[PDB]
With several copies, the nearest count.
Chain A
Amino acid sequence: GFKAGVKDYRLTYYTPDYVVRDTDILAAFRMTPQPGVPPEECGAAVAAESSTGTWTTVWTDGLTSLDRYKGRCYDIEPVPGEDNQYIAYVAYPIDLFEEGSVTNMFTSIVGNVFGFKALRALRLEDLRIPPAYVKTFVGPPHGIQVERDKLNKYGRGLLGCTIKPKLGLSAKNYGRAVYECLRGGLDFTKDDENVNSQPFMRWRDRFLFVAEAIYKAQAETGEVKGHYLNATAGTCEEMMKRAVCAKELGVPIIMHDYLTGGFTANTSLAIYCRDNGLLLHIHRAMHAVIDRQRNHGIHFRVLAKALRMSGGDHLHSGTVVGKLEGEREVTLGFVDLMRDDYVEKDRSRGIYFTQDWCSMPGVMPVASGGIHVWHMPALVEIFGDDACLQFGGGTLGHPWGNAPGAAANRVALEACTQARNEGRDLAREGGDVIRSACKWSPELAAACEVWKEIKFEF
């Protein structure tokens, strides 16, 4: 029967004896209750208010089968070295979610719960996306293999470069800088994440000149070249206009800021990229607002799984060693989550669930941000061949210009690949490989000279 009034969430939404089903979506929350709110009740509030429940008892419950549809808190670990912090485990039935919609999944799982008075802080650490939900997504337009096949590039990392200054350059100069970087041996150049269309440089003007640079560098080097033209925009109609123009120009690759753009715009663009054979570079602008702190937010591995589903060929992974934060073990873990078909549970890496991507193509990690030639071996060691490494300042900051800057980085990367291949251990003989190469290459030598002292440790 229907009994009006408030009662405890734990009565209905805490079910520690529940056997998870192969099709359930599973969330791992890092819960921090208010003093005097029992862990079980907090976990059940989260399970409730991200699924079927509200604050007082509703009669309409009887019309449906709450058993079928309810979110279920089904396990609680306490956190070692922590007084008031738990890992709550929630299972959500598959029926709860719109097929193919990341936006819907996030709306349920992170929609309201983070704001509850009954808790101090919440953090989503991982999701288990089951195969039967993964199959409902178009996913990445291409994926690493296909991208490599399209570009005709194998057996090494790819090299990119953000044009600098971020804002301020005219279209003409933008293309000029692009041509010089590309012809020196970089595979890619990119619009800076916030380069969209502005008074100093309108997008279509940039797209034209960039196309021209790409073609000049390609004819000159005889290697396939690309520049990630930014499709990020105010409205979907503008985003699409820009993608279409990129297509019309024959250029191989565009980029999008999936978080400031949004999942709905992003999925739209991924689908357009699938349908027209465009490579899609994803920039994670704004992630650190959400994923930086340990106590509260969503961890990046979840934002990465989410992007894999929505759709992207590249996703920025962080550098570990460069100017932006990124701890090593956790990074190696979410890179595996980005790239691999099957990733076994491994708590030492922050991986709370076995994730089976059931053949969804992998996304290529992009390591970018305050990295220069000295970092090369460390980067090649962390990421392997299937990564893109980007040098913005690292290229346009070289004393002899872009072409030399590019050459430098290309040589540094090739040297480390040869060394790795020849058997040399890159984690140890790192510095040695670089040094040998500087004594050999004038352009590399000028680069090593200028950034020798520069490190990012705190």
Chain B
Amino acid sequence: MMVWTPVNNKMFETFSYLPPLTDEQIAAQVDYIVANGWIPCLEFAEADKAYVSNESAIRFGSVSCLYYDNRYWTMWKLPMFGCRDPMQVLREIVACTKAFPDAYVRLVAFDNQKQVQIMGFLVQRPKTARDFQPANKRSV
């Protein structure tokens, strides 16, 4: 019987329960994005503004249901509309991680028909980050 650790095992939504994505597993997802016609986009946030919190709810009445800060990240350039080139997306991932080496960075895709974000996973965790666990030390 192994025990799942409460310290500091912070996750990151889709795919953060799998082993970290290889540069090629990332590329495979980008193929799936362009395969389906979806719009790719990059978002980033500094170490603080990355996790969901609620310090603006100090200004609220009883209306803080489904309100959390730091849902929104900062948009890297614009979303890439009708840009059907897998190569060019991977290049933008690089340009972005390069400009913000200390940021969290995630890749997202929008479906414009349903008008909703259709996928999204993390591509860069900052180096200073001490609040996650490697995939093997999650249970002791």
Interface residues of A, Cβ cutoff 8 Å to B:
1-2, 59, 62-65, 144-145, 148-156, 169-170, 172-173, 175-176, 179-180, 183-185, 200, 208, 211-213, 215-216, 218, 220-224, 245, 247-252, 276-279, 385, 399-401, 403-404, 407, 410-411, 414-415, 417-418, 421-423, 440, 442-443
> What distance in Å separates the Cβ of A255 from its nearest Cβ neighbour in chain B?
15
Instruction: Tell me whether A185 and B17 are in contact (CB under 8 A).
Output: yes
Interface size class of B (residues with CB under 8 A): 35 or more
Instruction: Tell me whether B13 and A212 are in contact (CB under 8 A).
Output: no
> What distance in Å separates the Cβ of B53 from its nearest Cβ neighbour in chain A?
9
Interface residues of B, Cβ cutoff 8 Å to A:
1-4, 6, 9-15, 17-19, 25, 28-29, 31-32, 39, 49, 51-52, 56-57, 59-72, 74-75, 77-83, 108-110, 112-121, 131, 138-139
Instruction: Tell me whether B52 and A218 are in contact (CB under 8 A).
Output: yes
Contact partners of B119 in chain A: CB under 8 A: 154-155, 421
Instruction: Tell me whether A212 and B56 are in contact (CB under 8 A).
Output: yes
Pick 30 A–B contacts, CB within 8 A, sort by A: A63-B79, A65-B115, A145-B115, A150-B66, A154-B13, A172-B116, A172-B117, A183-B4, A185-B11, A200-B115, A208-B67, A211-B56, A213-B72, A216-B49, A216-B70, A220-B10, A221-B9, A223-B13, A224-B68, A250-B59, A400-B77, A401-B75, A403-B3, A403-B4, A417-B15, A418-B15, A421-B28, A421-B32, A423-B31, A443-B2
Contact partners of A249 in chain B: CB under 8 A: 59-60, 63
Choose from B13, B39, B63, B117 the contact partner of A62 (Cβ within 8 Å): B39
Q: A63-B79, A148-B116 are in contact. Are A414 and B15 (CB under 8 A)?
A: yes
Choose from A65, A145, A252 the contact partner of B65 (Cβ within 8 Å): A252
Secondary structure of the B side of the interface?
loop
Which of A200, A222, A248, A249 has most B Cβ within 10 Å? A222
Instruction: Tell me whether B32 and A422 are in contact (CB under 8 A).
Output: yes
Seed contacts A63-B110, A252-B66, A414-B17; 9 additional CB < 8 Å A-B pairs: A148-B117, A149-B116, A183-B6, A220-B9, A221-B10, A245-B63, A248-B60, A417-B14, A421-B32
Choose from B65, B79, B110, B117 the contact partner of A276 (Cβ within 8 Å): B65
Choose from A59, A218, A410 the contact partner of B17 (Cβ within 8 Å): A410
